[PDB]
Amino acid sequence: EAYFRVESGALGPEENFLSLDDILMSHEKLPVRTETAMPRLGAFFNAVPQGSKLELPLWLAKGLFDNKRRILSVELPKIYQEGWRTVFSADPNVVDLHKMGPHFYGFGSQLLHFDSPENADISQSLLQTFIGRFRRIMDSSQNAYNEDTSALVARLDEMERGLFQTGQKGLNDFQCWEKGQASQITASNLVQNY
Amino acid sequence: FMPTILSRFDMIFIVKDEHNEERDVMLAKHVITLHVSIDLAKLKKFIAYCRVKCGPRLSAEAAEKLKNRYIIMRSGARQHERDSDRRSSIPITVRQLEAIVRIAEALSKMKLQPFATEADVEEALRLFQVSTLDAALSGT
């Protein structure tokens, strides 16, 4: 109630520095093709050729990128390719955005700092998927009371679980006021140890 | 029992006993342990979560442990079977090695420890030194 973690800026211009969600977000891998040799460090993948397909975290490919593609170029995973961008248009209420994740909107908004050609078509997928999956989170979260919700929440990602936990915290708080139950003073964080 | 349906397994436990009067005191103990006659109800719901959250593999050191254990397990079976060759025996096979590895995985899954080490490989190997010598005594 007073532990206010630093929130995630993974949807705006640039992720926050201290947010433990973005730190684990950017760690996810991404495919690149190198433009030069990689001397003195070919141990991991001593030198590495130019024109080689490698898998690197996102944070690494932040500074190793330039406009001229001096060191390496990037190509998007298939989840954001043209293939799946039609699937997410058929009916977005069917996809398991936890397997295709578990950071869909967080990752996809950082792949816009690579000035690829099809950006005007990724920032339209996300917008049209989130709008598609809305009337199923506005209604399965404000209307699921004293139920086992661990199956209404099995196909969501970190940007959506944060909202499914705000619908419930406002349902279970009006239903606790209606029943004269939110008058008793209780232990706040000690019942967490118990 | 063929040496092949027997070899379809990996661990053989045969039963044995003694008869000393201190051993007979152990037997007198065990008498009433039956004469009289961590919970499962949570053990099952523990396993249900342990099996589904651990991804154990082996660490680089367990590799060179097992290589040198298994090579020296093989290295004597030759002089064992080249002379006596009592029409039946049981030597080591790579299937048994893979069994060892998948046993060490299940040991290091008790601890939610995503990387196994020498902490259990040797005791598993000794458990197997029991389990293979059992069939060694039975098959001869």
């Binding site: 298939k78 699937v87 069917v94 | 790579v94």
Partner: protein, 608 residues
């Protein structure tokens, strides 16, 4: 894993007037990129009835119609198939009359409609769905009338009649009375040549085994194929039918039970698994013609080294298994004789020498490979067994294993746990190449030109290295001649190999191109080299030196007898070694590559 599209979305790169006038506008397609005017013509040049559509396009073009089509499939597919005949008459009216009516399949990505026969509830009635699963039976293809043409011999007129049943998109039950006197005065006579019939089948999809909750008997569903979709599915497949869902009522004696039977009126079919590789790029064929020319000396050895990297040792066995995967050349003389062109390999040895591994790899590499064991296989269940039908009750001949795998591979593991009365059922199908059955009411001859890869544990549990190669193998000298290559892979006891084998397997437990051998052998299979007199006089000599016991050695026993049947296995291994080089003429370097293999596989050495 959820199949939310027939095209696997991961790696695809490597009144009723509004509907009819909107479909036509969609089928114009000229002004944007001409995607369908490139397909209507395409099918007219192939004489097809139906064309496959992508609903993904209908969405981008018009969302309202794309939604109204997935929820009222009948009234929309009777307007689609009208405004398709309309648009084909707008190209070639002469063609637009050859066929009675056109059809239109579907494909794309439906939102929640991708269901299994287990989830197909009764909220999908009259709604396009896309069912996945296994076919587990078929029906007998039968005609079904859709129009008659009658004739009056007295009045010299000609009357017609249009038929319709409950398996249409309009569903009016007409009576098949076949009028014989419309007006009591004149008599009629049907004309079958001018009438119109169509085909009709009925298959049964069933839920996939590894998707069932395993507690029950997985659910099923009934499909009604038609109009040249008919034979598109055999028992044992993995199909993705895309058809309307329908309930068909009934009444026995003016009193109907509310219970109905629901079927799926299919309008497209897709085999999910790709079981062929003829799709090669011109860049690929360029690579192939490069590699086949780079070095003719070392391309066979280089091919075989890259065969099964997951296995250490056994270079000879890999060489021979490659020879298997290529094959010889089947010569059929002019008088009608026939000489087989396959290689049958047998591997015996102590336990845990990766035999089963080699088998399980040859299974997946070659197309059309069938697995089989030594106890789950009877002598008759391998070739052909006589049975009956449940609908007709008259006998027929169900094909065994070694007849399904024609022009393919059959992998028999634990070939020694097979009783003596069961091996004998193979001696005809391993050499002559075709099975002959003369049972009670059945006299047939099936074609079974295949190749056998077999693995057998030796007698005494382990290969006693002192007895002899003949006492360690139970097979009699008549079966031992069929298999032309016998490899004794006794557990490598030498301490060196075990070291690298352990290294390899343990590395695997800490987690030439692979997908190129596929294309390369699928291409080099068709070549048909021809012997030349430079080598044909070398084989005709190495054989006559093999056949002479003296020239062999002393303290050397024979694994199998040398007959006039190993002579034309020399010829087969040779012209299968000059198939990797894509050479087309066998040379003296071939007839010597295939002689050392024999010299090594035939003679064994005994110790004491």
């Amino acid at each position: 894993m959820l199949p939310r599209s027939p095209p696997l979305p991961r790696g695809n790169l490597w009144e009723l007037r509004e509907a009819q006038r909107d479909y036509l506008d969609f089928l114009d397609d000229e002004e944007d990129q001409g995607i369908y005017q490139s397909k209507v013509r395409e099918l007219i040049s192939d004489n097809q009835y139906r064309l496959i559509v992508n609903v993904n396009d209908l969405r981008r073009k018009n969302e309202k119609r794309a939604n109204r089509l997935l929820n009222n499939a009948f009234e929309e597919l009777v307007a689609f198939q009208r405004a398709l005949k309309d648009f084909v008459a707008s190209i070639d009216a002469t063609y637009a009359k050859q066929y009675e009516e056109f059809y239109v399949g579907l494909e794309g990505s439906f939102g929640s409609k991708h269901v299994s026969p287990r989830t197909l509830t009764s909220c999908f009635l009259s709604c396009v769905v896309c069912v996945e699963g296994i076919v587990t039976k078929c029906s007998l293809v039968r005609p079904k009338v859709v129009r008659s043409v009658h004739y009056c011999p007295a009045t010299k007129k000609t009357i017609e009649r249009r038929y319709s049943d409950l398996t249409t998109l309009v569903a009016f039950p007409s009576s098949s009375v076949y009028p014989t006197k419309d007006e009591e005065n004149n008599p009629l006579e049907t004309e079958y040549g001018l009438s119109v019939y169509k085909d009709h089948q009925t298959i049964t999809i069933q839920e996939m085994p590894e998707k069932a909750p395993a507690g029950q008997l997985p659910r099923s569903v009934d499909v009604i194929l038609d109009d040249d979709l008919v034979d598109k599915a055999k028992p044992g497949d993995r199909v993705q039918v895309v058809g309307t869902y329908r309930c068909l009522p009934g009444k026995k004696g003016g009193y109907t039970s509310g219970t109905f039977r629901t079927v799926l009126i299919a309008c497209n079919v897709k085999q999910m698994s790709k079981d062929a590789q003829p799709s090669f790029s011109a860049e690929d064929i360029a690579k192939i013609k490069k590699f086949s020319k780079t070095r003719s000396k070392d391309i066979f050895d280089q091919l075989a080294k890259s065969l099964a990297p997951s296995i250490h040792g056994h270079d000879y066995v890999k060489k021979a298994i490659l020879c298997l995967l290529l094959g010889g050349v089947e010569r059929d003389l002019e008088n009608g004789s026939h000489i087989r062109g396959d290689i049958n390999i047998l591997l015996i040895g102590d336990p845990s020498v990766a035999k089963s591994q080699l088998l399980r790899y040859v299974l997946c590499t070659a197309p059309r490979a069938i697995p089989t064991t030594g106890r789950g296989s009877s002598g008759v269940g391998l070739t052909a067994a006589v049975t009956t039908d449940q609908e007709t009750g008259e006998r027929r001949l169900e094909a065994g294993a070694m007849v399904l795998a024609d022009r393919g591979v059959v992998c028999i593991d634990e070939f020694d746990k097979m009783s003596d009365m069961d091996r004998t059922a193979i001696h005809e199908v391993m050499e002559q190449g075709r099975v002959t059955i003369a049972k009670a009411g059945i006299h047939a001859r099936l074609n079974a030109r295949c190749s056998v890869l077999a693995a057998a544990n030796p007698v005494y549990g382990r290969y006693d290295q002192y007895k002899t190669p003949m006492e360690n193998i139970g097979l009699q000298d008549s079966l031992l001649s069929r298999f032309d290559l016998l490899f004794i892979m006794l557990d490598q006891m030498d301490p060196e190999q075990d070291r690298e084998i352990s290294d390899h397997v343990l590395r695997m437990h800490r987690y030439v191109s692979a997908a190129f051998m596929k294309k390369y052998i699928h291409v080099a299979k068709i070549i048909k080299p021809v012997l030349t007199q430079e080598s044909a006089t070398y084989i005709a000599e190495e054989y006559s030196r093999l056949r002479s016991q003296d020239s062999m050695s002393s303290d050397t026993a024979r694994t199998s007898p040398v007959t006039a049947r190993t002579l034309e296995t020399l010829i087969r291994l040779a012209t299968a070694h000059a198939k990797a080089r894509m050479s087309k003429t066998v040379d003296l370097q071939d007839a010597e590559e295939a002689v050392e293999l024999v010299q090594y596989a035939y003679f064994k050495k005994v110790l004491e």
